[PDB]
């Protein structure tokens, strides 16, 4: 029996007539993969694929809505000009950027090769969500024992704890999770840096060996557990003064 299978073929019917190593043509399954597994929390939308068939050029307008931070997601809108045969991207332009990502995307999108731009935007959204999750975890761990508050527009966490040794002097720790978008310089991906800063009564510790300690603990325990152990070391001397 000879059967013709297309993009709308049933999964069971495709597995009936599968004897090649080519990927499955069930296009609902392909888009389910593309939406749920490789790029979750991204509401892509295409609304106009009109063409100028005299020139053989396809005009595509798509909207990328990075909805990982569902409270205030940032969205972008591209415009691509295809060649539709001997495929060359003659021109691409950015139609609209959400204002809450407009500066970082303005520095990033100034360079060409929009594939790097899309991957960098998705990676920056993912890394910012990871930053918010890590900071929320540390806040929930240290909400009641210490005083937790975010500043530098939620890029630095300040944890303060008074200590016994004097007339109740305070020990405050600042941990940073600054995220940098590559505009001037060594690749296209959005980078992230972690550094700590410790104060006891208003006197800054030496940043060299403190950064050595931060590097060692993060290298040993990862990021979440590493930052937890940095907080435990730099906030609770009485627990470790045996």
């Amino acid at each position: 029996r000879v059967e013709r299978i297309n993009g709308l073929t049933n999964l069971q019917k495709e597995l009936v007539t599968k004897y090649d190593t080519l990927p499955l043509l069930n296009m609902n399954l392909r888009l389910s993969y593309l939406r749920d597994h490789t790029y979750p929390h991204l509401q892509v939308s295409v609304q106009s694929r009109d063409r100028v068939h005299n020139d053989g050029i396809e005009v595509l307008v798509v909207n990328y809505k990075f909805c990982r931070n569902t409270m205030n997601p940032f969205e972008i809108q591209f415009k691509m000009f295809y060649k539709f045969e001997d495929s060359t991207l003659l021109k691409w332009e950015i139609l609209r950027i959400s204002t809450n990502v407009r500066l970082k995307a303005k520095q990033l999108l100034a360079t060409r090769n929009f594939q790097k731009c899309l991957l960098s935007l998705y990676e920056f959204d993912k890394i910012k969500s990871k930053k918010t999750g890590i900071f929320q975890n540390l806040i929930n761990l240290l909400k009641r024992k210490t005083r937790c508050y975010l500043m530098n527009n939620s890029d630095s966490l300040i944890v303060e704890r008074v200590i016994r040794e004097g007339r109740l002097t305070t020990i405050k720790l600042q941990i940073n999770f600054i995220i940098t978008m590559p505009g001037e310089r060594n690749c296209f991906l959005p980078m992230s840096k972690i550094s700590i800063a410790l104060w006891k009564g208003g006197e800054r510790f030496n940043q060299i060996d403190l950064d050595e300690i931060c590097y060692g603990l993060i290298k040993e325990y990862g990021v979440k557990t590493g930052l937890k152990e940095i907080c435990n070391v730099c906030l609770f001397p009485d627990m470790y003064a045996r």
Binding site: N6, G7, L8, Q12, L15, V16, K18, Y19, D20, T21, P23, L24, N26, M27, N28, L29, R30, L31, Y33, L34, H37, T38, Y39, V44, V46, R49, L60, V62, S87, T88, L89, L90, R112, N113, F114, Q115, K116, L118, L119, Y122, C187, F188, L189
Partner: protein, 143 residues
């Protein structure tokens, strides 16, 4: 029909939009791993496969380079992906990158995407280096 053709048409356009990213997951079945459950004839895949493709954008030619496919099959006894087949040359240690991802075994799609990104960065590196040197040749600065 023509409405189902329209929805498949938009599905193909959306799949191309997703593949414009560079790192995509596509479903895959090994024909050997097709078996019947014999209850009523439901053909189920025995060992689930996962294939990824890496389409790097060559800005000099304004073209998409030909994709590099890495195919991951599930281990039968451990429920974890392993490097089954790949179309990436040997100067990029894809086996070492895969073993470095999550310290060996990978389970979730996040670890597979991390391995995919780690090797796609190498593809970006070689393509960008070749692009810079070919542009140096094109500007007639060097012989």
């Amino acid at each position: 029909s023509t409405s189902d053709r329209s929805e498949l048409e938009d599905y193909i356009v959306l799949e191309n939009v997703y593949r414009m990213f560079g790192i995509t997951f596509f479903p895959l079945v090994d024909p050997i791993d097709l078996k019947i459950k014999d209850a009523s004839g439901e053909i189920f895949v025995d060992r689930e496969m996962l294939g990824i493709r890496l389409e790097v954008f060559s800005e000099r030619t304004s073209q998409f380079e030909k994709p590099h496919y890495v195919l991951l099959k599930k281990r039968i006894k451990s429920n974890s992906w392993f490097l089954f087949k790949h179309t990436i040359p040997s100067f990029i240690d894809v086996q070492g990158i895969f073993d470095d991802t999550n310290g060996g075994l990978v389970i979730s799609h996040d670890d597979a995407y991390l391995f995919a990104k780690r090797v796609f960065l190498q593809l970006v590196e070689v393509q960008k280096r070749r692009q810079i040197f070919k542009d140096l040749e094109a500007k007639k600065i060097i012989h």
